[PDB]
Design a protein around this ligand. Structure first.
Ligand SMILES: [Ca+2]
Ligand code: NA
Lengths: 64, 281
């Protein structure tokens, strides 16, 4: 079961959402700016996407 | 009737409660998404919001801060859950918005507020993969000023031989807390590395949620407030102990588990920590 997407780093946030939803269709995706601080609960249904100021993926997406 | 979540028992908080110590008069800042002050199983003493578009720290639009707060300090009564330090003076220091995120300056502003308002303990169930000099300076200043600073280690799991502990947990001045389950097994998501200090329960942890609810959450976020609550119990029994002493007491009395890369010093044991003489069980 795929839980990380290192191949999405540097892609657009749009492509990342499409790809993650193909692998995990019930994913709860939240887009956040890279370099913010976030809550540290672990939610297996969630995938945060950290984007740079250009809206490309700046961190390996993972479930949690 | 009230229920005692397994993690409160697991860290031996009831031993302190039976001695008569529950965190009275200890000020704990939950630096997080706010705390729902209308919850009947919480008593919020004060707070402040650093989130520009969410000015009320007593409204928790995310839920996470309220859950963390209930592990620190859910009230001792006939309802809901019991907190680790149910008499602590609980402060909602809102630095994260509804989406669970905040800017570094907001977190730093919250830490500065906590120092200015004489907090005894800070809990930061939060983190990110990079530090900043200003973040490091804020936590170091809090510790130099006498505050016990506790944070979640992070939920990055393993990555070979690399540390995956996040900031501010990764700073030496901060106690970074990893997560175990009820069998004392490390949770698969729990961050690892030589910066991991101690472990606490972080799997299926029941606590308070906004709108007078309860529920079970997982994460190093859930483990951290067991340690922040334990620090408050210790200070309520030993009100002159410094933060240095509180931190050593927790580190020096853990139940050792596996290799320190994965488990740090092991599971905290607040009964043993709050004795004068410390050793591991
Ligand atoms: Ca209660
Ligand atoms: Na640390």
């Amino acid at each position: 079961m795929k839980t990380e997407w290192p191949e999405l780093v540097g892609k657009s946030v749009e492509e990342a959402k499409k790809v993650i939803l193909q692998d995990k269709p019930a994913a709860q995706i939240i887009v956040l700016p890279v370099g913010t601080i976030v809550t540290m609960a672990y939610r297996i249904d969630r995938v945060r996407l950290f984007v740079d100021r250009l809206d490309n993926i700046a961190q390996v997406p993972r479930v949690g | 009737a009230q229920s005692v979540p397994y993690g409160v028992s697991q860290i031996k908080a009831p031993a302190l409660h039976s001695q008569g110590y529950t965190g009275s008069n200890v000020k704990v800042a939950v630096i997080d998404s706010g705390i729902d002050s209308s919850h009947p199983d919480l008593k919020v003493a004060g707070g402040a919001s650093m989130v520009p578009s969410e000015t009320n720290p007593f409204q928790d639009n995310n839920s996470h801060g309220t859950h963390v707060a209930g592990t620190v300090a859910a009230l001792n009564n006939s309802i809901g859950v019991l907190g680790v330090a149910p008499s602590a003076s609980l402060y909602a220091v809102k630095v994260l918005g509804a989406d669970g995120s905040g800017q570094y300056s907001w977190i730093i502003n919250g830490i500065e507020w906590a120092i200015a308002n004489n907090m005894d303990v800070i809990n930061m169930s939060l983190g990110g993969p990079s530090g900043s000099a200003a973040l490091k300076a804020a936590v170091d200043k809090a510790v130099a000023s006498g505050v016990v600073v506790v944070a979640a280690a992070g939920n990055e799991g393993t990555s070979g031989s690399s540390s995956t502990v996040g900031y501010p947990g990764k700073y030496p001045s901060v106690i970074a807390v990893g997560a175990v389950d009820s069998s004392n097994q490390r949770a698969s998501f729990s961050s690892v590395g030589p910066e991991l200090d101690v472990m606490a329960p972080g799997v299926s942890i029941q606590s308070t949620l906004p709108g007078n609810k309860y529920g079970a959450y997982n994460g190093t976020s859930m483990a951290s407030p067991h340690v922040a609550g334990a620090a408050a119990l210790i200070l309520s029994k030993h009100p002159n102990w410094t933060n240095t002493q509180v931190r050593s007491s927790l580190e020096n009395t853990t139940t050792k588990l596996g290799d320190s890369f994965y488990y740090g010093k092991g599971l905290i044991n607040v009964q043993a920590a709050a004795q004068h003489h410390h050793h591991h069980h």
